């Protein structure tokens, strides 16, 4: 209703997960995962909420999913010393930051050992570093 | 044993506390000299990194620390870095220091100081288009 797509797009990504339950040394490949991000009206707040959406045919179990709005973010920028506001975030990471992924920006995705959440993280390297930029916990839909 | 690798006026934000009772800090943009050189521990006989910074505007403005490889494996870990020790100083020298050609954006230090001045985080920054870009950050001391 409220909702309004700001990017869907399949990228490449590295997925990693633990071997199992009891052996948490990852497990890694490149993949491709669909993207869709939007932002939405909350329906009981009528505040903006940006949603992250990723899904892949490799895995009818791979749908995940996080919600921000406004306060999250706020959680989010000073985790990760990010530098712009809530409302220019999507568009800058979309304007500047994820058109390089389609099918240097790097996309890895983690998986808890269940699957239940997933750490969508975005990286941009530098001469001595990985250059982590963010990571968003996104969690199971199913 | 000690050879320069690296000895040049940079442009660096120093920040640090109003006062010894006031926390929050204050931000001017300075000149600082920073030197890097390899030299070899007096006792082990094993490679050192050492780390120098100076600055005019204030004579007791002089800090320094020197990394080994251990001390090295641990900023690696904690900053996530991809190159080994011996590489280390050359990339940022080569690649991060270094003045472009005029013809991932510019790189910025930041140096943030102990209330008491006896001890500053000296920072290396490459921006991102949206987050400050924290390469990584040595501890230096009070010389």
Known sequence: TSKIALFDQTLIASLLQPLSLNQPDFKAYKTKVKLKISEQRNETSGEKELKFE??????FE?????????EKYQILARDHDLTVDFDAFPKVI????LCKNIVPTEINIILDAEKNFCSFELFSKTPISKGKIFSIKLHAVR
Do not use: A, K, P, V
């Not at 990723?54 to 895995?59: L, T």
């Open 54 to 59: 990723i899904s892949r045919s490799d895995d």
């Open 62 to 70: 791979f749908l995940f999913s996080e919600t921000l709005n406004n």
């Open 94 to 97: 979309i304007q500047h930051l």
